[PDB]
Amino acid sequence: MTDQAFVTLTTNDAYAKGALVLGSSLKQHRTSRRLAVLTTPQVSDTMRKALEIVFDEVITVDILDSGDSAHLTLMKRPELGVTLTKLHCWSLTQYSKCVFMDADTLVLANIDDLFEREELSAAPDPGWPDCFNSGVFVYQPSVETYNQLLHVASEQGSFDGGDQGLLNTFFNSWATTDIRKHLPFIYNLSSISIYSYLPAFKAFGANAKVVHFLGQTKPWNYTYDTKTKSVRSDPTMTHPQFLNVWWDIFTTSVVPLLQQFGLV
Amino acid sequence: VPRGSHMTDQAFVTLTTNDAYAKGALVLGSSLKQHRTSRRLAVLTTPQVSDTMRKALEIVFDEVITVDILDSGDSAHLTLMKRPELGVTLTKLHCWSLTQYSKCVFMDADTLVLANIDDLFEREELSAAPDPGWPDCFNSGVFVYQPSVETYNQLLHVASEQGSFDGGDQGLLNTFFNSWATTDIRKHLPFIYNLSSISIYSYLPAFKAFGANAKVVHFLGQTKPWNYTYDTKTKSVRSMTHPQFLNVWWDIFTTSVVPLLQQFGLV
């Protein structure tokens, strides 16, 4: 379709890269939907033009601007900057339904079938499995839902200072209702469970469809030996296995593009 | 004594592979009673549990079934032969052979009840909570089931054919009841019935947010409660949720178990 898309957020040039790899992986796996990305003033004009190459739409969001819907809220709760910025994904009404994906995720296979789910379908969080991990979720853009969330943010904020805490306080029926809204863990694999319940990973990690590099060091901070074709830190574990797929894509599909803007 | 209806067809089953866990079994049951459960308390024991300790169990628990898979006559035996690493696993599965019950809630000895959980009996065959590791597998630490010799033989076969993907019972029980993750949300016990003592510090915020309601604690991981050192005077263990819990465990072990234990041997 063209009224259905993948939305991601890029708060700056660092993540901007993850955004580039994300989209690239999405394309590489032949998605038929659109690729939109929300950017903030913090992303360099140059980098921003590279995004325009990979993504179909490049919406700019600046909650610091007094004119922005979220602004007044940011005032009340300053710690929710990135959170309110991400929520703008709900304001992209030019789409009927979208699948949001943080820039620190990676697609390992076609996931277009996620568009079969309805408002707030996400996978569980390895931490407290009765909360969904806001790293990958399917939603219906709606200005109301947007204002809805905004209010909640203002009234009670995030129980964890992030968007996952807000999004979970709002869509608080996910854990106990409609199993169809429970995305399989492999649509969002957290790169800790791939070594935490290691056996489980060795068992089903193979099917992994989306990887979520959450935690301390993001993929773009590892060091990649282009010659040996792997990262620093043999490795028959989940994570590297993945970190290498990320770098293969960054090197093969992004760098070139980046170099042309003299960004690399 | 107002003693409300006593379910004698539904019970809480736990396993004690030896004297160490035997203590956890004692604390478990005790917490269960302390929180006024109306069901029965059964416990499966193996030859490894001392005759003495075994008699203490008979004080706290209603039934004390003895399971010895090494015995050539035991149903599991032939399977243990095929897969030796599944000893404890096949021993725990015997919980399904306790047909004197219509429905039971199983709980590993390294768990602790912080509140009445008798309402777990409202669920059906294989309801459990998710595992903090790979949340699409249920943590076999606390689950509700219907004893059935068939279901038992069912599992036994699976064990023999493909074994456990993680060498434990949770791997087998998840390979069998493999519909849990994507079917019947009513069979998804809330994390607070099977809380793991890592998420209480792992997604620390989340704990600080809902850990308060915690109904059952699951001391999984390296050091079991019975291996910590408790200062009876200061009333706490050696080196906030977690200790918070380890202390409740020790308060119960000291207040309700020790006495019972002391009056025999090994105080």
Coordinates of C-alpha atoms in Angstrom, one line a residue:
Chain A
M1 CA 0.0 0.0 0.0
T2 CA 0.8 3.7 0.2
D3 CA -1.3 4.6 3.2
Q4 CA 0.6 2.1 5.3
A5 CA 4.2 2.7 6.3
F6 CA 7.2 1.9 8.6
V7 CA 8.0 4.8 10.9
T8 CA 11.3 5.3 12.8
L9 CA 12.8 8.1 14.8
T10 CA 16.2 9.8 14.5
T11 CA 17.0 12.2 17.3
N12 CA 20.4 12.9 15.9
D13 CA 23.2 11.8 13.5
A14 CA 24.3 8.8 15.5
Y15 CA 20.9 7.1 15.5
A16 CA 20.6 8.6 12.0
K17 CA 22.8 5.8 10.9
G18 CA 20.7 3.1 12.6
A19 CA 17.8 4.7 10.8
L20 CA 19.6 4.2 7.5
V21 CA 20.4 0.6 8.2
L22 CA 16.9 -0.1 9.4
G23 CA 15.2 1.3 6.3
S24 CA 17.9 -0.4 4.1
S25 CA 17.1 -3.7 5.7
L26 CA 13.4 -3.1 5.2
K27 CA 14.0 -2.4 1.5
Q28 CA 16.5 -5.3 1.2
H29 CA 13.7 -7.6 2.3
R30 CA 11.3 -6.2 -0.3
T31 CA 8.7 -4.4 1.8
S32 CA 5.7 -3.1 -0.1
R33 CA 4.9 -0.3 2.4
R34 CA 6.3 3.2 2.8
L35 CA 9.3 4.2 4.9
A36 CA 8.9 7.4 7.0
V37 CA 11.3 8.8 9.5
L38 CA 10.8 11.6 12.1
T39 CA 13.8 13.9 12.6
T40 CA 14.7 16.7 15.0
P41 CA 16.7 19.9 14.5
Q42 CA 19.6 18.0 16.1
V43 CA 20.1 16.0 12.9
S44 CA 22.5 17.7 10.5
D45 CA 21.2 19.2 7.3
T46 CA 23.6 17.0 5.4
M47 CA 22.6 13.7 7.2
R48 CA 19.0 14.8 6.8
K49 CA 19.4 14.9 3.0
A50 CA 20.8 11.3 3.0
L51 CA 17.7 10.2 4.9
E52 CA 15.7 11.7 2.0
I53 CA 17.5 9.2 -0.3
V54 CA 16.5 6.1 1.7
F55 CA 13.2 7.1 3.2
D56 CA 10.1 8.2 1.3
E57 CA 9.0 10.9 3.8
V58 CA 11.3 12.8 6.2
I59 CA 9.0 14.6 8.7
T60 CA 10.7 17.1 11.0
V61 CA 9.5 17.4 14.6
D62 CA 10.7 20.1 17.0
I63 CA 8.9 20.0 20.3
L64 CA 11.0 22.9 21.5
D65 CA 9.1 25.1 19.0
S66 CA 6.4 26.8 21.0
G67 CA 4.0 26.0 18.1
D68 CA 4.3 22.2 18.5
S69 CA 1.4 20.3 19.9
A70 CA 3.6 18.6 22.4
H71 CA 5.4 21.7 23.6
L72 CA 3.1 22.7 26.5
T73 CA 3.5 19.1 27.7
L74 CA 7.3 19.1 27.5
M75 CA 7.1 22.1 29.8
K76 CA 5.3 20.1 32.4
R77 CA 7.6 17.1 32.0
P78 CA 11.0 18.1 30.6
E79 CA 12.4 14.5 30.9
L80 CA 10.0 13.3 28.3
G81 CA 11.6 15.0 25.3
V82 CA 12.4 12.0 23.2
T83 CA 9.2 10.4 24.4
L84 CA 6.9 13.2 23.2
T85 CA 8.9 13.4 20.0
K86 CA 8.3 9.7 19.2
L87 CA 4.6 10.0 20.0
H88 CA 4.4 12.3 17.0
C89 CA 4.4 9.1 15.0
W90 CA 0.6 9.1 15.8
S91 CA 0.2 12.4 14.0
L92 CA 1.2 11.0 10.7
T93 CA -2.4 10.7 9.6
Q94 CA -1.4 10.3 5.9
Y95 CA -1.2 6.7 6.9
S96 CA -4.0 4.4 7.9
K97 CA -1.8 2.0 9.9
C98 CA 1.9 1.9 10.6
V99 CA 4.5 -0.3 12.3
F100 CA 6.9 1.8 14.4
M101 CA 10.5 0.7 14.8
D102 CA 13.3 2.3 16.8
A103 CA 16.5 3.1 15.0
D104 CA 18.4 0.5 17.0
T105 CA 16.5 -2.4 15.4
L106 CA 17.3 -4.4 12.4
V107 CA 15.1 -6.4 10.0
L108 CA 16.3 -9.9 9.1
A109 CA 13.3 -10.8 7.0
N110 CA 10.1 -9.5 5.5
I111 CA 7.7 -8.4 8.2
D112 CA 5.0 -6.9 6.1
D113 CA 2.5 -9.2 7.7
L114 CA 2.6 -7.1 10.8
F115 CA 0.1 -4.9 9.0
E116 CA -2.5 -7.6 9.8
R117 CA -2.6 -6.5 13.5
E118 CA -4.6 -3.6 15.0
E119 CA -4.0 -0.7 17.4
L120 CA -1.2 -1.6 19.8
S121 CA 0.2 -5.0 19.0
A122 CA 3.8 -5.4 20.3
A123 CA 6.0 -8.1 21.7
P124 CA 6.7 -8.7 25.4
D125 CA 9.7 -7.1 27.2
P126 CA 12.3 -9.5 28.5
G127 CA 12.3 -7.5 31.7
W128 CA 8.8 -7.5 33.0
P129 CA 7.0 -9.6 30.4
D130 CA 3.6 -8.1 31.3
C131 CA 4.6 -4.8 29.6
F132 CA 5.2 -4.7 25.9
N133 CA 8.6 -3.5 24.5
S134 CA 7.9 -0.2 22.6
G135 CA 10.8 -1.1 20.3
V136 CA 8.4 -2.4 17.6
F137 CA 4.7 -1.9 17.6
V138 CA 1.8 -1.6 15.1
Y139 CA -0.6 1.3 15.4
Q140 CA -3.3 3.5 13.7
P141 CA -2.3 7.2 13.3
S142 CA -4.9 9.3 15.0
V143 CA -4.8 12.9 16.2
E144 CA -7.2 11.9 19.0
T145 CA -5.1 9.0 20.2
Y146 CA -2.2 11.5 19.9
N147 CA -3.9 14.0 22.2
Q148 CA -5.0 11.1 24.4
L149 CA -1.4 10.1 25.0
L150 CA -0.3 13.6 25.4
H151 CA -2.7 14.2 28.2
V152 CA -1.7 11.0 30.0
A153 CA 1.9 12.1 29.7
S154 CA 1.1 15.4 31.3
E155 CA -1.0 13.8 34.1
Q156 CA 1.1 10.9 35.2
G157 CA 4.2 10.9 33.0
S158 CA 6.3 7.8 32.3
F159 CA 6.9 5.2 35.0
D160 CA 10.3 4.6 33.5
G161 CA 11.2 8.0 32.0
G162 CA 10.9 6.6 28.5
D163 CA 8.3 6.1 25.9
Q164 CA 7.8 2.4 26.8
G165 CA 6.6 3.5 30.2
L166 CA 4.0 5.9 28.8
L167 CA 2.9 3.7 26.0
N168 CA 2.4 0.9 28.5
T169 CA 0.4 3.0 31.0
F170 CA -1.9 4.0 28.2
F171 CA -2.4 0.8 26.3
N172 CA -2.7 -1.1 29.6
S173 CA -4.9 -3.8 28.3
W174 CA -2.2 -5.5 26.2
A175 CA -1.0 -7.9 28.9
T176 CA -4.4 -9.5 29.6
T177 CA -6.4 -9.0 26.5
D178 CA -6.5 -10.2 22.9
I179 CA -3.6 -12.6 22.4
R180 CA -3.7 -11.5 18.7
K181 CA -2.1 -8.3 20.0
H182 CA 0.9 -10.2 21.3
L183 CA 3.5 -10.0 18.6
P184 CA 5.8 -13.1 18.7
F185 CA 9.1 -12.3 20.4
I186 CA 10.9 -12.8 17.1
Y187 CA 9.5 -9.5 15.8
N188 CA 11.4 -7.8 18.3
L189 CA 14.3 -9.9 19.7
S190 CA 16.2 -8.2 22.5
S191 CA 19.9 -8.8 22.1
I192 CA 20.2 -9.9 25.7
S193 CA 17.8 -12.8 25.7
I194 CA 19.9 -14.1 22.8
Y195 CA 22.5 -14.8 25.6
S196 CA 20.3 -14.5 28.7
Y197 CA 18.1 -17.6 28.2
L198 CA 20.8 -18.7 25.8
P199 CA 19.2 -22.1 25.4
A200 CA 15.9 -20.6 24.2
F201 CA 17.8 -18.5 21.7
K202 CA 19.7 -21.5 20.4
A203 CA 16.3 -23.0 20.1
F204 CA 14.2 -20.4 18.3
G205 CA 16.6 -17.4 17.8
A206 CA 17.1 -18.9 14.4
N207 CA 13.7 -17.6 13.2
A208 CA 14.4 -14.1 14.5
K209 CA 12.8 -11.6 12.2
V210 CA 13.7 -8.3 13.9
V211 CA 16.6 -7.7 16.2
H212 CA 16.6 -4.9 18.8
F213 CA 20.1 -3.8 19.7
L214 CA 19.1 -2.3 23.1
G215 CA 21.5 -1.8 25.9
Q216 CA 24.8 0.0 26.6
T217 CA 26.7 0.0 23.2
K218 CA 24.7 0.6 20.0
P219 CA 25.8 -1.2 16.8
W220 CA 27.2 2.1 15.4
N221 CA 29.7 2.3 18.4
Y222 CA 31.3 -1.1 17.8
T223 CA 34.4 -1.3 15.7
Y224 CA 34.1 -3.2 12.4
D225 CA 37.1 -4.9 10.7
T226 CA 36.0 -4.6 7.1
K227 CA 38.7 -7.0 6.0
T228 CA 37.9 -9.8 8.5
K229 CA 34.2 -8.9 8.1
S230 CA 33.2 -8.7 11.8
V231 CA 33.1 -6.6 14.9
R232 CA 35.6 -6.2 17.8
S233 CA 34.9 -7.1 21.5
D234 CA 35.0 -18.1 17.3
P235 CA 31.7 -16.2 17.7
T236 CA 28.7 -18.4 17.2
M237 CA 26.5 -16.4 19.4
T238 CA 23.4 -14.5 18.6
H239 CA 24.5 -10.9 19.1
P240 CA 27.7 -10.9 17.0
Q241 CA 25.9 -12.9 14.5
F242 CA 23.5 -10.0 14.4
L243 CA 26.0 -7.1 14.9
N244 CA 27.7 -8.4 11.8
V245 CA 24.5 -8.3 9.7
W246 CA 24.1 -4.8 10.8
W247 CA 27.6 -3.8 9.8
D248 CA 27.4 -5.7 6.5
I249 CA 24.4 -3.6 5.7
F250 CA 25.9 -0.3 6.9
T251 CA 29.0 -0.9 4.9
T252 CA 27.4 -2.3 1.8
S253 CA 24.4 0.0 1.6
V254 CA 24.9 3.0 3.8
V255 CA 28.6 4.1 3.8
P256 CA 28.5 4.7 0.0
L257 CA 25.5 7.0 0.3
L258 CA 27.0 8.7 3.3
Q259 CA 30.4 9.2 1.6
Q260 CA 28.7 11.1 -1.2
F261 CA 27.6 13.8 1.3
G262 CA 31.1 13.7 2.6
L263 CA 29.5 12.4 5.8
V264 CA 31.9 9.4 6.1
Chain B
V1 CA -13.9 -23.2 63.7
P2 CA -15.3 -21.4 60.7
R3 CA -13.0 -23.5 58.6
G4 CA -14.3 -22.8 55.2
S5 CA -14.8 -25.5 52.5
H6 CA -11.6 -27.6 52.3
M7 CA -10.8 -28.5 48.9
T8 CA -9.5 -32.1 49.1
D9 CA -9.4 -32.6 45.4
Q10 CA -7.2 -29.6 44.6
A11 CA -3.7 -29.0 46.0
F12 CA -0.4 -27.3 45.9
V13 CA 2.4 -29.6 44.7
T14 CA 6.1 -28.9 45.2
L15 CA 9.3 -31.0 44.7
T16 CA 12.2 -31.6 47.0
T17 CA 15.1 -33.4 45.5
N18 CA 17.1 -33.3 48.7
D19 CA 17.5 -31.7 52.2
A20 CA 18.6 -28.3 50.9
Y21 CA 15.5 -27.7 48.8
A22 CA 13.6 -29.5 51.6
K23 CA 13.9 -26.3 53.5
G24 CA 12.5 -24.2 50.7
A25 CA 9.7 -26.7 50.5
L26 CA 9.1 -26.0 54.2
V27 CA 9.1 -22.3 53.8
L28 CA 6.9 -22.6 50.7
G29 CA 4.2 -24.7 52.4
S30 CA 4.4 -22.5 55.5
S31 CA 3.9 -19.4 53.5
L32 CA 0.9 -21.1 51.8
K33 CA -0.7 -21.9 55.1
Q34 CA 0.2 -18.5 56.6
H35 CA -1.8 -17.0 53.8
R36 CA -4.8 -19.2 54.6
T37 CA -5.0 -21.5 51.6
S38 CA -8.0 -23.8 51.5
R39 CA -6.4 -26.4 49.3
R40 CA -4.1 -29.3 50.1
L41 CA -0.3 -29.2 50.3
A42 CA 1.5 -32.2 48.6
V43 CA 5.2 -32.6 48.2
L44 CA 7.2 -35.1 46.0
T45 CA 10.4 -36.4 47.6
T46 CA 13.3 -38.6 46.4
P47 CA 15.5 -41.1 48.3
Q48 CA 18.0 -38.4 48.6
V49 CA 15.9 -36.6 51.3
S50 CA 16.8 -37.8 54.8
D51 CA 14.4 -39.9 56.7
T52 CA 14.5 -37.3 59.4
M53 CA 13.9 -34.4 57.1
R54 CA 11.2 -36.4 55.4
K55 CA 9.3 -36.7 58.7
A56 CA 9.4 -32.9 59.2
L57 CA 7.8 -32.6 55.8
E58 CA 5.0 -34.8 57.0
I59 CA 4.3 -32.2 59.6
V60 CA 3.8 -29.3 57.2
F61 CA 2.5 -31.1 54.1
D62 CA -0.7 -33.1 53.9
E63 CA 0.8 -35.7 51.5
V64 CA 4.4 -36.7 51.1
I65 CA 4.7 -38.8 47.9
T66 CA 8.0 -40.5 47.4
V67 CA 9.3 -40.7 43.8
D68 CA 12.4 -42.8 42.8
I69 CA 12.9 -42.9 39.0
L70 CA 16.1 -44.9 39.6
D71 CA 13.8 -47.8 40.6
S72 CA 13.3 -50.0 37.6
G73 CA 9.7 -50.2 38.4
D74 CA 9.0 -46.5 38.0
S75 CA 7.1 -45.3 34.9
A76 CA 9.8 -42.8 34.1
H77 CA 12.7 -45.1 34.5
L78 CA 12.9 -46.4 30.9
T79 CA 12.9 -42.8 29.8
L80 CA 15.6 -41.8 32.3
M81 CA 17.7 -44.5 30.6
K82 CA 17.3 -42.8 27.2
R83 CA 18.0 -39.3 28.6
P84 CA 20.0 -39.4 31.9
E85 CA 20.3 -35.6 32.1
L86 CA 16.5 -35.4 32.7
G87 CA 16.5 -36.9 36.1
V88 CA 15.0 -34.0 38.1
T89 CA 12.8 -33.3 35.1
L90 CA 11.2 -36.7 35.0
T91 CA 10.8 -36.6 38.8
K92 CA 8.9 -33.3 38.7
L93 CA 6.6 -34.5 35.9
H94 CA 5.4 -37.1 38.3
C95 CA 3.3 -34.3 39.7
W96 CA 0.9 -35.2 36.8
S97 CA 0.5 -38.7 38.3
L98 CA -1.1 -37.4 41.5
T99 CA -4.6 -38.2 40.2
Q100 CA -6.1 -38.0 43.7
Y101 CA -6.4 -34.3 42.7
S102 CA -8.6 -32.8 40.0
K103 CA -6.4 -29.8 39.5
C104 CA -3.2 -28.5 41.1
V105 CA -0.9 -25.5 41.1
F106 CA 2.8 -26.6 41.0
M107 CA 5.4 -24.5 42.7
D108 CA 9.2 -25.1 42.8
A109 CA 10.7 -25.2 46.3
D110 CA 12.6 -22.0 45.6
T111 CA 9.5 -19.9 45.4
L112 CA 7.7 -18.0 48.2
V113 CA 4.1 -17.0 48.6
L114 CA 3.5 -13.4 49.7
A115 CA -0.3 -13.5 49.5
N116 CA -3.3 -15.9 49.0
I117 CA -3.2 -17.3 45.5
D118 CA -6.0 -19.8 45.8
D119 CA -7.6 -18.0 42.8
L120 CA -5.1 -19.7 40.6
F121 CA -7.5 -22.7 40.7
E122 CA -9.7 -20.8 38.3
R123 CA -7.4 -21.5 35.4
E124 CA -7.1 -24.6 33.2
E125 CA -4.4 -27.0 31.9
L126 CA -1.1 -25.1 31.6
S127 CA -1.5 -21.6 32.7
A128 CA 1.8 -20.1 33.8
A129 CA 3.6 -16.8 33.7
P130 CA 6.1 -15.6 31.1
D131 CA 9.8 -16.1 31.5
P132 CA 11.9 -12.9 31.8
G133 CA 14.4 -14.6 29.5
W134 CA 12.5 -15.4 26.3
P135 CA 9.0 -14.2 27.1
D136 CA 7.4 -16.5 24.6
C137 CA 8.1 -19.4 26.9
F138 CA 6.4 -19.8 30.2
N139 CA 8.5 -20.1 33.4
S140 CA 7.8 -23.6 34.8
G141 CA 8.3 -22.2 38.3
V142 CA 4.6 -21.9 39.0
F143 CA 1.9 -23.5 36.8
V144 CA -1.7 -24.7 37.1
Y145 CA -2.5 -28.2 35.8
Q146 CA -4.9 -31.2 35.7
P147 CA -3.3 -34.4 36.9
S148 CA -3.7 -37.1 34.2
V149 CA -1.9 -40.3 33.7
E150 CA -2.3 -39.8 29.9
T151 CA -0.9 -36.3 29.9
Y152 CA 1.8 -37.9 32.0
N153 CA 2.6 -40.6 29.5
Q154 CA 2.2 -37.9 26.8
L155 CA 5.1 -35.8 28.3
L156 CA 7.2 -38.9 29.0
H157 CA 7.1 -39.8 25.3
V158 CA 8.0 -36.2 24.2
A159 CA 10.9 -36.3 26.7
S160 CA 12.1 -39.6 25.2
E161 CA 11.7 -38.4 21.6
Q162 CA 13.2 -34.9 21.7
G163 CA 14.3 -34.2 25.3
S164 CA 14.6 -30.7 26.8
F165 CA 15.8 -27.9 24.7
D166 CA 17.4 -26.5 27.9
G167 CA 18.1 -29.6 29.9
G168 CA 15.5 -28.7 32.4
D169 CA 11.7 -29.2 32.9
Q170 CA 10.9 -25.8 31.6
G171 CA 12.2 -26.8 28.2
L172 CA 10.2 -29.9 28.0
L173 CA 7.0 -28.4 29.4
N174 CA 7.3 -25.6 26.9
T175 CA 8.0 -27.9 23.9
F176 CA 4.9 -29.8 24.9
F177 CA 2.4 -27.1 25.8
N178 CA 3.6 -25.1 22.9
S179 CA 0.4 -23.2 22.3
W180 CA 0.7 -21.1 25.5
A181 CA 2.5 -18.1 23.8
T182 CA 0.0 -17.5 21.1
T183 CA -3.3 -18.9 22.5
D184 CA -5.8 -18.1 25.2
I185 CA -4.6 -15.0 27.1
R186 CA -6.5 -16.5 30.1
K187 CA -3.7 -19.0 30.3
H188 CA -1.1 -16.2 30.8
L189 CA -0.7 -15.9 34.6
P190 CA 0.2 -12.3 35.6
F191 CA 4.0 -12.0 36.2
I192 CA 3.2 -11.3 39.9
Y193 CA 2.3 -15.0 40.4
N194 CA 5.6 -16.1 39.2
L195 CA 8.0 -13.1 39.7
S196 CA 11.6 -13.7 39.2
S197 CA 14.1 -12.1 41.5
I198 CA 16.2 -10.6 38.6
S199 CA 13.5 -8.5 37.0
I200 CA 13.0 -6.9 40.5
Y201 CA 16.4 -5.3 39.7
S202 CA 16.7 -5.9 35.9
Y203 CA 13.8 -3.6 34.7
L204 CA 14.2 -2.1 38.2
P205 CA 11.7 0.7 37.3
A206 CA 9.0 -1.8 36.4
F207 CA 9.6 -3.5 39.7
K208 CA 9.4 -0.2 41.6
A209 CA 6.2 0.3 39.7
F210 CA 4.3 -3.0 40.2
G211 CA 6.7 -5.2 42.2
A212 CA 4.6 -4.1 45.2
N213 CA 1.7 -6.3 44.2
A214 CA 4.0 -9.3 43.9
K215 CA 2.1 -12.4 45.0
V216 CA 4.7 -15.1 44.5
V217 CA 8.5 -14.7 44.4
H218 CA 10.7 -17.1 42.6
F219 CA 14.3 -17.0 43.9
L220 CA 15.9 -18.4 40.8
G221 CA 19.6 -17.9 40.1
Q222 CA 23.0 -18.7 41.6
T223 CA 22.4 -18.5 45.4
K224 CA 19.2 -19.9 46.9
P225 CA 17.6 -18.3 49.9
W226 CA 18.9 -21.1 52.1
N227 CA 22.5 -20.3 51.2
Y228 CA 22.4 -16.7 52.3
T229 CA 23.5 -15.8 55.9
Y230 CA 20.8 -14.4 58.2
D231 CA 21.5 -12.2 61.1
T232 CA 18.7 -13.1 63.4
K233 CA 19.4 -10.1 65.6
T234 CA 19.5 -7.5 62.9
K235 CA 16.8 -9.4 61.1
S236 CA 18.1 -9.5 57.6
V237 CA 20.6 -11.3 55.3
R238 CA 24.2 -10.6 54.4
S239 CA 25.7 -9.3 51.1
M240 CA 15.8 -3.2 47.5
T241 CA 13.1 -5.5 46.4
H242 CA 15.3 -8.7 46.4
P243 CA 16.5 -8.4 50.0
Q244 CA 13.0 -7.2 50.8
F245 CA 12.0 -10.7 49.8
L246 CA 15.0 -12.8 51.0
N247 CA 14.1 -11.3 54.4
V248 CA 10.5 -12.5 54.3
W249 CA 11.8 -15.9 53.4
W250 CA 14.1 -16.0 56.4
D251 CA 11.5 -14.5 58.7
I252 CA 9.3 -17.5 57.9
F253 CA 12.2 -20.1 58.0
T254 CA 13.2 -18.8 61.4
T255 CA 9.8 -18.2 62.9
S256 CA 8.0 -21.3 61.5
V257 CA 10.6 -23.8 60.2
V258 CA 13.6 -23.8 62.5
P259 CA 11.5 -24.8 65.6
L260 CA 10.1 -27.8 63.7
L261 CA 13.5 -28.7 62.3
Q262 CA 15.4 -28.1 65.6
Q263 CA 13.1 -30.3 67.6
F264 CA 14.5 -33.2 65.6
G265 CA 18.0 -32.6 64.4
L266 CA 20.3 -30.1 62.6
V267 CA 18.9 -26.9 64.3

